[PDB]
């Protein structure tokens, strides 16, 4: 499928989140930035349908990359 490299701002993807349980879901999130500072992409993504505090910097294992909408 799609690639990391191909992730920009604006896309639009499941990221993996714990919830106030412990538990893994995949709520869809928009891509807000992409930082390529470390050597490694982080992505900063605001989780949607959830508060604006919520947002988290993410590395590519939570993506789901076989679901993306591009902008």
């Given at each position: 499928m799609a690639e990391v490299g191909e992730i920009i701002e604006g896309c639009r993807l499941p990221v993996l989140r714990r919830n106030q349980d412990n538990e893994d879901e995949w709520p869809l999130a928009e891509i807000l930035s992409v930082k390529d500072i470390s050597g490694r992409k982080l992505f900063y993504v605001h989780y949607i349908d959830?508060?604006?505090?919520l947002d988290e910097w993410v590395t590519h294992?939570?993506?789901?990359?076989?679901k993306i909408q591009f902008p």
């Open positions: 959830f508060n604006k505090r294992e939570r993506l789901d990359l076989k």
